[PDB]
Write an enzyme that holds these catalytic residues in place. Structure first.
Site, PDB file in Angstrom:
ATOM      1  N   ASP A  35       4.439  -0.468  -3.309  1.00  0.00           N
ATOM      2  CA  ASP A  35       4.315   0.843  -2.630  1.00  0.00           C
ATOM      3  C   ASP A  35       3.523   0.950  -1.795  1.00  0.00           C
ATOM      4  O   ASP A  35       2.317   1.528  -1.441  1.00  0.00           O
ATOM      5  CB  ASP A  35       4.022   1.912  -3.655  1.00  0.00           C
ATOM      6  CG  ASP A  35       4.358   3.036  -2.508  1.00  0.00           C
ATOM      7  OD1 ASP A  35       4.944   2.850  -1.948  1.00  0.00           O
ATOM      8  OD2 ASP A  35       3.678   4.198  -3.094  1.00  0.00           O
ATOM      9  N   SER A 199      11.286   1.342  15.348  1.00  0.00           N
ATOM     10  CA  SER A 199      12.599   1.185  15.962  1.00  0.00           C
ATOM     11  C   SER A 199      13.235   1.154  17.238  1.00  0.00           C
ATOM     12  O   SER A 199      12.960   2.127  17.623  1.00  0.00           O
ATOM     13  CB  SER A 199      13.659   1.614  14.652  1.00  0.00           C
ATOM     14  OG  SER A 199      14.659   1.699  14.912  1.00  0.00           O
TER      15      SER A 199
END
Length: 330
Positions: A35, A199
């Site tokens: 994770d 992004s």
């Protein structure tokens, strides 16, 4: 040193991935959920409330000659999906794919919430976010990657998740045969303890690319792609009959649909998520309503590039003094 381990979907939807991890002496092999959105290595154990164990493999520290109680240390964690676990702490030898760390904090669960009990395939979590998020008190502990870093040939790990197939976690090296083209690296903020990046935009299907900054986290422990409501609405508007269902808890679409791809930007590069990766199947057995793999982050507080996005790429988690993320097509 290096390590290399195969990671395997737990089910036919890629709801999560499990990677075998050797703990203790002699080794006890548990299948952990790696994770990159959390920083605790915790396991089902001989200390876990019996009624909360249902099929998991357990770590028994009393059977490990190298286990030592970390006296006074406790841990307690709550995840973004509302699940939780807590307990005490041992140090022990932990190996992943041939890479060994001695003295790793292994957090033994005394209690786990129902979602963990109900998932017999996941024996615990191995956190790979920054150690500043580790919950052990009163002495915070380091992640497996942080402990291994100095010994690694290069201070990196890579995630190469498969679509409906196994993939690979590598530690200490970048497998240049595992991706196509070049790796595009992008800046990371560690201010919230995550692999947080920005992004450069998105496209839906064959549509034009929209240049817009989307801050979010690279999180292997989250199944889906969670993005701003504007972006998610633009995606689902291209699927006839798709709608957001409050009763189901997100966007659903007719199972008869063919889904468009979704592209996200990494600097000037582009990662394309095929439409099939966004299909999470019937909302309930036999239903003709299917659950979408792109969902709104509006109720989370952070955008999450979960497995839906990451499995479309070869992803480098660069833990150099100034961390960065790298993405390549594959």
């Amino acid at each position: 040193s290096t390590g290399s381990a195969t990671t395997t979907p737990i089910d036919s939807l890629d709801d999560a991935y499990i990677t075998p991890v050797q703990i203790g002496t002699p080794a006890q092999t548990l299948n952990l959920d790696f994770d990159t959105g959390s920083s605790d290595l915790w396991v089902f154990s001989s200390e876990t409330t019996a009624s909360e164990v249902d099929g998991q493999t357990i770590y028994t520290p009393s059977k490990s000659t190298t286990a030592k109680l970390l006296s006074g240390a406790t841990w307690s964690i709550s995840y973004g999906d509302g699940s939780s676990s807590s307990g005490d702490v041992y140090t022990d030898t932990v190996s992943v794919g041939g890479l060994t760390v001695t003295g790793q904090a292994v957090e033994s669960a005394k209690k786990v919430s129902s979602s963990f009990t109900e998932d017999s395939t996941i024996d615990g979590l191995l956190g790979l976010a920054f150690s500043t998020l580790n919950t052990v008190s009163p002495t915070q502990q380091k992640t497996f990657f942080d402990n291994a870093k100095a010994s690694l040939d290069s201070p990196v790990f890579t995630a190469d998740l498969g679509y409906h197939a196994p993939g690979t976690y590598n530690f200490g090296f970048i497998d240049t045969t595992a991706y196509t083209g070049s790796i595009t690296y992008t800046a990371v903020s560690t201010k919230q303890g995550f692999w947080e990046w920005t992004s450069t935009g998105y496209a839906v299907g064959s549509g034009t690319f929209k240049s817009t900054s989307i801050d979010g986290i690279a999180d292997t422990g989250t199944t889906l792609l969670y993005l701003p409501a504007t972006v998610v609405s633009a995606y689902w508007a291209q699927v006839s009959g798709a709608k957001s269902s409050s009763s189901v808890g997100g966007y659903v679409f007719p199972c008869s649909a063919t889904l468009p791809s979704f592209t996200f930007g990494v600097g000037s590069a582009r990662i394309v998520i095929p439409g099939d990766y966004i299909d999470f199947g019937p909302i309930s057995t036999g239903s003709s309503s299917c659950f979408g793999g792109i969902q709104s982050s509006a109720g989370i507080g952070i955008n999450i590039f979960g497995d839906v996005a990451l499995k479309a790429a070869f992803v480098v988690f660069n833990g150099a003094t100034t961390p960065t993320l790298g993405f390549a097509s594959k």
